[PDB]
Structures are given as C-alpha cells and as structure tokens.
Amino acid sequence: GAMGSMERASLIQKAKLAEQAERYEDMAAFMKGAVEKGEELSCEERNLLSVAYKNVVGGQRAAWRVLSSIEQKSNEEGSEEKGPEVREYREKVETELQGVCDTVLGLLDSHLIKEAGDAESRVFYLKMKGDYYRYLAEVATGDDKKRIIDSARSAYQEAMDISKKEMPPTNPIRLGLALNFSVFHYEIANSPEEAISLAKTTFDEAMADLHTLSEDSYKDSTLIMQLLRDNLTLWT
Amino acid sequence: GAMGSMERASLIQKAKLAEQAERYEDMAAFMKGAVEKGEELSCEERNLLSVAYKNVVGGQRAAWRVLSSIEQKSNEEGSEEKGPEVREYREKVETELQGVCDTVLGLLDSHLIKEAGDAESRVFYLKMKGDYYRYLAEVATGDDKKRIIDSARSAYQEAMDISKKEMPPTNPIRLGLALNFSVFHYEIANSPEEAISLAKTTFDEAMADLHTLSEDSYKDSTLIMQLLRDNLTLWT
Amino acid sequence: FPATV
Amino acid sequence: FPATV
Numbered sequence: 001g002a003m004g005s006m007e008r009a010s011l012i013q014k015a016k017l018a019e020q021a022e023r024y025e026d027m028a029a030f031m032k033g034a035v036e037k038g039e040e041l042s043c044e045e046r047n048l049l050s051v052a053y054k055n056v057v058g059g060q061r062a063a064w065r066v067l068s069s070i071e072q073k074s075n076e077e078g079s080e081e082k083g084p085e086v087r088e089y090r091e092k093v094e095t096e097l098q099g100v101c102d103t104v105l106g107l108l109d110s111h112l113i114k115e116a117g118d119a120e121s122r123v124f125y126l127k128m129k130g131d132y133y134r135y136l137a138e139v140a141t142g143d144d145k146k147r148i149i150d151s152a153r154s155a156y157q158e159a160m161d162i163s164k165k166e167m168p169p170t171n172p173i174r175l176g177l178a179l180n181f182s183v184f185h186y187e188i189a190n191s192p193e194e195a196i197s198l199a200k201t202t203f204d205e206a207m208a209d210l211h212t213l214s215e216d217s218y219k220d221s222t223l224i225m226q227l228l229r230d231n232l233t234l235w236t
Numbered sequence: 237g238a239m240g241s242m243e244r245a246s247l248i249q250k251a252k253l254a255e256q257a258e259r260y261e262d263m264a265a266f267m268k269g270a271v272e273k274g275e276e277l278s279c280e281e282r283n284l285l286s287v288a289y290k291n292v293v294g295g296q297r298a299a300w301r302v303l304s305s306i307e308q309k310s311n312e313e314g315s316e317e318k319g320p321e322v323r324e325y326r327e328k329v330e331t332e333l334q335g336v337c338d339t340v341l342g343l344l345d346s347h348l349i350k351e352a353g354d355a356e357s358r359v360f361y362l363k364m365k366g367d368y369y370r371y372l373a374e375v376a377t378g379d380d381k382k383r384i385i386d387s388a389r390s391a392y393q394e395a396m397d398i399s400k401k402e403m404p405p406t407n408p409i410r411l412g413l414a415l416n417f418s419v420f421h422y423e424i425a426n427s428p429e430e431a432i433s434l435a436k437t438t439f440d441e442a443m444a445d446l447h448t449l450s451e452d453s454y455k456d457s458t459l460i461m462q463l464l465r466d467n468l469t470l471w472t
Numbered sequence: 473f474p475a476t477v
Numbered sequence: 478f479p480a481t482v
C-alpha cells in the first residue's frame with residue numbers, strides 16, 4: 001500500500017484537491033488508500049471514490065473504443081495490412097482498463113460490501129460492482145464472457161431488490177442504479193425491451209413521488225430522471 | 237528503456253494511435269522510445285514528440301496552478317490552518333512536472349540537438365529546450381532560479397539567431413518560437429516591453445512576407461500570426 | 473452512447 | 478494566460 005503511511009483524513013483532503021485539479025488518477029489512488037484504512041466510508045467519501053474511478057475508467061473506455069474502431073477497420077475487406085500494432089495497443093489499453101476494474105472490484109469485495117448495512121451504502125456499492133463488471137463485459141470476448149455478464153446482472157439485481165424495499169422511488173442512488181441497469185440490459189444483455197421498460201417504469205414511479213420532496217431533493221432527482229428520458233428518446 | 241524491444245516504426249505508429257485516442261502519456265512514452273533508438277527524427281516525428289509532451293506538461297501546469305492558487309489562499313491572513321496537505325500535494329505535482337521537463341531536456345541533450353544541422357530541426361529543438369526550461373522557471377523558487385531562467389533565454393536566443401538567418405519570417409517554426417519567446421519575456425523575465433516589441437515586429441515582418449506563400453502555407457502562417465495579435469491585445 | 477452515472 | 482504553441 002503506497003498510501004499506507006498517509007493519514008486517512010489527509011488522503012481524503014488530497015482526493016478533494018486532486019478533483020479540483022482534474023487529476024483523477026491521483027484522486028483514485030488517494031481514495032484507494034483511504035478505503036484500505038479499513039474504516040467504512042461516509043456518503044461524501046463514497047462519492048469521491050466513485051467520481052475518481054469513473055473518470056479514470058471513462059477515459060480508458062473512450063480510448064478503447066477509438067482503438068477498437070481503428071482495429072475493426074484495419075481487418076475489413078480490401079484494407080491494407082498495417083501489422084500487429086493496432087491490436088497490440090488496443091490490448092494494452094484493454095489490460096489497463098481490466099486492471100482498474102479488478103482494483104475497484106477488489107476494494108468492494110475487501111471489504112466495503114460486507115460491512116455496508118444501510119441501504120444508501122449497500123446499494124451504492126452493489127451498483128458500483130455492477131458497473132465495473134459491466135465495463136469488463138464491454139471488452140470481454142472469451143470463455144468467461146457469460147459469467148462476467150452474469151456477475152454484473154447479479155450485483156445490479158441485488159441492488160435493485162434492496163432499493164425497492166428500502167428507498168423511495170426518487171432516491172438519486174436508486175435512480176442512477178436503474179439508469180445504469182437499463183443501459184446494461186440494452187448494451188450488454190441484448191435486452192432492449194427490458195432496458196426500455198425499466199427506464200419508463202423508473203421515470204414514472206419517480207414522477208409520482210416528486211411531490212414529497214424539498215426543492216433541493218427535487219433538483220437532484222429530476223436531473224437523473226432527465227437522463228432516463230434522454231435514453232428513452234435514443235431508444236424509441 | 238522500457239521501449240527498447242519495440243521497433244522504431246511500431247513506436248511511431250503507436251504514438252499516432254495514442255494521439256487519436258487522446259492518450260498523451262502513452263504517446264510521450266512511445267516517442268521517448270523512438271528518440272532513444274538514436275536516429276534523427278523527421279519533421280512529422282518531431283511534431284509527434286512535441287505534441288505528446290506538450291499535452292502531458294500542459295495538464296501538469298494546469299494542475300499546479302490550481303493547487304498553487306489554493307495554497308496561496310490557505311496562507312493568507314485570517315485563513316484557517318488546513319495542515320501540510322496542500323503544500324505537499326502541490327509539491328508532488330511540481331516534482332512530477334519537473335521530472336517531465338528533465339526527461340524532455342534529457343532527450344534534447346542526448347542527443348537530438350547535437351545531431352540537428354538543418355535549421356528546421358535545430359530551431360525546433362532549441363525552441364523546445366527554451367520551452368521546457370521556461371516550464372521549470374514557472375515553478376522555480378530557490379538558488380538556481382536565475383540560472384534556470386537564463387537557460388531558457390539562452391536556448392531561445394540561439395534559436396532566434398538561427399531562425400533569422402536561415403528561415404523566412406513566415407516560417408511557422410520561426411513564428412511559434414517568437415510567440416513563445418515573447419511570452420517568456422512577459423511572464424518569466426519581467427520584460428513586458430520586450431515581449432510586446434518582439435510580438436509586434438514578428439507579426440509585421442510575417443505580414444510583409446505572406447505574398448510569397450501558397451494558400452496552404454498562408455493558412456499555417458496566419459494561424460500563428462493571430463496568436464501574436466491575441467497576445468498583443470491581452471497586453472496593450 | 474447512452475447516459476449512465 | 479497568453480498563447481504559446
């Protein structure tokens with residue numbers, strides 16, 4: 001643990017500084033160090049962790065897609081052989097991406113999930129587990145592809161089951177979980193109808209519960225509801 | 237040399253792929269490996285090298301400025317002591333930035349400059365030497381600050397002297413050199429009048445030589461001339 | 473690509 | 478900041 005000698009509070013402070021400086025790799029390393037202190041994470045700390053790794057893996061995914069597109073065009077009919085380099089570099093980025101996913105899943109399994117008893121923490125971490133298995137699934141091609149997909153599905157389903165029993169339909173964690181599980185159905189599981197049904201039902205149940213909210217909670221919930229509607233517009 | 241086992245041509249190809257994927261740290265590592273093959277660089281290869289490291293150090297500089305601003309506010313009057321963390325993290329980013337500059341200067345001194353005999357290569361590398369000493373100067377605070385500043389000045393001056401003798405006043409390398417040396421005068425040497433005079437004279441001498449150019453050369457030169465004018469507008 | 477958070 | 482290339 002390269003961060004083992006730094007105070008937990010100092011790691012959290014430096015994660016916040018790294019965020020302001022748009023140094024997301026640093027932010028992720030700081031938050032990994034904080035997790036490895038072994039204490040549970042507060043709500044703010046959980047979101048620092050997720051923001052950091054989402055930005056890191058997001059850049060990797062964007063790069064992988066560029067390289068995968070180039071590689072597919074280099075293997076088309078009539079294309080000129082450019083050598084192993086495109087595949088090699090796509091593989092390099094892919095391996096680094098898988099490594100980030102393995103790291104995040106590792107933090108969740110040792111030992112964030114098993115200590116998370118409140119719905120807002122447990123649903124948050126199970127959503128993250130689904131998300132990072134989904135990123136593995138985006139690049140998976142071999143014997144374990146179906147098991148990787150099912151690992152994502154299983155995590156998202158447990159998170160959904162808890163969220164429906166323990167959170168109001170406008171809870172932003174519940175909403176973001178449903179948004180992302182819907183995308184899993186559409187893009188990973190080849191289940192566009194399930195994706196569309198989930199997005200619609202989530203939006204409608206949230207709409208019916210907005211009346212209970214303060215102005216600030218309303219803003220948080222309607223922001224994610226607009227993303228559900230954006231996806232529905234893309235898909236219908 | 238982590239890239240010692242990869243073919244030169246494969247390193248160049250992967251640098252181009254990394255650029256398309258906006259993976260500038262990878263692009264820089266590939267181009268460092270290419271330089272370390274020991275052969276001179278073509279024009280395209282020189283620009284791949286400069287693009288890669290400019291993006292890397294540019295991100296570092298942007299982060300350093302954010303952190304330096306936070307640090308200065310934390311040391312103001314009436315501010316609440318937040319501990320050593322802001323300084324420590326600013327120092328971490330600063331040390332990484334200095335390391336990138338030391339790496340680029342190292343490539344220029346071993347052995348790109350000494351083998352560069354044509355004006356377009358030699359002026360290009362001496363401009364880079366001035367640029368990376370300037371980035372060191374931006375963060376320098378101790379006994380060697382004046383020597384770092386003078387190292388930048390000396391490199392830029394040699395590049396200017398060659399460029400005036402060997403290149404037309406519209407040459408885009410000559411123009412970019414003058415743009416950046418002007419910024420050195422303004423921001424590093426505390427010589428705003430020299431900065432303004434250099435930008436004006438460079439712009440006017442370029443304007444008078446545009447008539448000699450093709451449409452494509454005209455576009456390249458006028459793009460940089462607009463940056464000279466933008467700086468003059470900022471400064472007057 | 474579709475929106476996720 | 479001023480422009481450089």
Ligand SMILES: N=C(N)c1cc(-c2ccccc2)c(NC2CCCCC2)s1
Pocket residue numbers: 019043044047048051172220
């Ligand atoms: N540095 C940050 N990026 C965050 C900090 C916080 C936060 C701050 C204080 C208390 C709880 C959470 C965040 N929250 C989430 C969840 C609630 C809606 C806004 C996004 S993102």
Ligand SMILES: N=C(N)c1cc(-c2ccccc2)c(NC2CCCCC2)s1
Pocket residue numbers: 255279280283284287408456
């Ligand atoms: N990948 C690239 N970013 C580049 C590739 C090249 C280049 C390509 C072919 C021949 C010479 C240079 C570049 N040139 C410079 C200097 C001339 C004006 C444009 C910017 S930037």
Ligand SMILES: [Mg+2]
Pocket residue numbers: 007008
């Ligand atoms: Mg302690």
Ligand SMILES: [Mg+2]
Pocket residue numbers: 091094095
């Ligand atoms: Mg692979």
Ligand SMILES: [Mg+2]
Pocket residue numbers: none
């Ligand atoms: Mg259902």
Ligand SMILES: [Mg+2]
Pocket residue numbers: 243244
């Ligand atoms: Mg060879």
Ligand SMILES: [Mg+2]
Pocket residue numbers: 327330331
């Ligand atoms: Mg220092």
Ligand SMILES: [Mg+2]
Pocket residue numbers: none
């Ligand atoms: Mg003069």
